């Protein structure tokens, strides 16, 4: 009865079902966990918000078209305005979190296409001016739940002030490496003939036990069309991709007044 | 007359032989973790218990 294709995930007051999964990935074979006393750093008693924040948040959906070049988000950035997770994040200097990432994309037995879904630690991307290096604004680096898109062209700006955004060039993974090698990162593929969802469980990954969430994204989430969407009755059709992410084993230190980042 | 001692850990023992007849010739003294900050931080005649009033 039980199947690699059928799964339920419950976190807090939220549940996901899928009937066309393809197993699930646990990044680097490690489930998330709380921070042990023998690896701890800040000494204040941490806040562990548990069910208030460790639950599925669904981002705004994006549309997959035959011409789409792909999508990216950063974490914890994409969830910074999500319910109590966002509040706990911004009221504290320090935070750590794992995640369950559930990417959703159904179609029909007559559609075709394949999405690579990658979780990338320290997903540093190229800037869009050749007058400077590492020249990206905080606002452009941290788009929140809307994330960003890849392009198949690189057109760096005439003036440095206009190029302070990522050059998200698809085939170089926005960072000067070949996209065909992205499979070294934890990943699944949503191949429409096979499955309609990808599930990745991510431990906290960093060179520190805990860090400043508002300064530093631990993971990138990349969705790249490896094989373009095609549908014979209408090649211009679009199908939604929906991203739903739950923080897990969240832990926060250094409580004070709320952080309100710059918006422009 | 070789002395085998623990190394300071890096990212486990080492050997020392003294070659000279004067101790002044020797390499650095071994790590001495001794301390007693209270001779400077609390040189008081009568014991002060933190949880108690300093003056009663």
């Amino acid at each position: 009865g039980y199947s690699d294709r059928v799964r339920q995930i419950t976190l807090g007051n939220s549940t996901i079902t899928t009937q066309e999964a393809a197993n699930a990935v646990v990044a680097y074979g490690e489930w998330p966990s709380y921070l042990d006393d023998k690896e701890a750093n800040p000494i204040d008693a941490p806040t562990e918000p548990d069910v208030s924040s460790n639950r599925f948040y669904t981002l705004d959906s994006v549309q997959w078209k035959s011409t789409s070049r792909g999508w990216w988000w950063k974490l914890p950035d994409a969830l910074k305005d999500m319910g109590m997770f966002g509040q706990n994040m911004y009221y504290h200097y320090l935070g750590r979190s794992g995640y369950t990432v559930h990417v959703q994309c159904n179609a029909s037995k007559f559609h075709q296409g394949a999405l690579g879904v990658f979780a990338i630690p320290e997903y540093v991307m190229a800037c869009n001016t050749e007058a400077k290096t590492s020249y990206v604004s905080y606002v452009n680096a941290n788009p929140g739940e809307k994330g960003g898109v890849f392009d198949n062209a690189y057109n760096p700006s005439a003036e440095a002030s206009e190029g302070r955004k990522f050059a998200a060039l698809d085939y170089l993974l926005g960072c000067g490496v070949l996209a065909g090698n992205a499979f070294v990162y934890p990943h699944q593929i949503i191949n429409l003939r096979t499955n309609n969802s990808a599930t990745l469980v991510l431990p906290y990954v960093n060179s520190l036990a805990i860090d400043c969430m508002a300064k530093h994204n631990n993971w990138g989430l990349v969705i790249l069309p490896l094989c373009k969407l095609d549908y014979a009755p209408n090649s211009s059709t679009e199908i939604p991709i929906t991203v739903t992410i739950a923080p897990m084993f969240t832990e926060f230190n250094g409580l004070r007044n709320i952080t309100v980042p710059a918006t422009q | 007359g070789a002395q085998v001692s623990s190394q300071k850990v890096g990212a486990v023992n080492y050997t020392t032989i003294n070659y000279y007849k004067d101790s002044a010739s020797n390499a650095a003294s071994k790590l001495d973790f001794s301390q007693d900050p209270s001779k400077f931080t609390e040189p008081v005649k009568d014991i002060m218990i933190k949880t108690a009033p300093a003056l009663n």
Binding site: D37, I43, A45 | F33, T41, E42, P43, V44, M48, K50, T51, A52, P53, A54, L55
Partner: peptide, 27 residues
């Protein structure tokens, strides 16, 4: 020998007042 570890502690409501002292003592 290491520098001091931090013990697990909660709060208090107590006549024990380690936050107060008198540095006139020379301590």
């Amino acid at each position: 020998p290491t520098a001091q570890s931090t013990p697990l502690t909660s709060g208090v409501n107590s006549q024990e007042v380690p936050a107060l002292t008198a540095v006139e003592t020379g301590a």
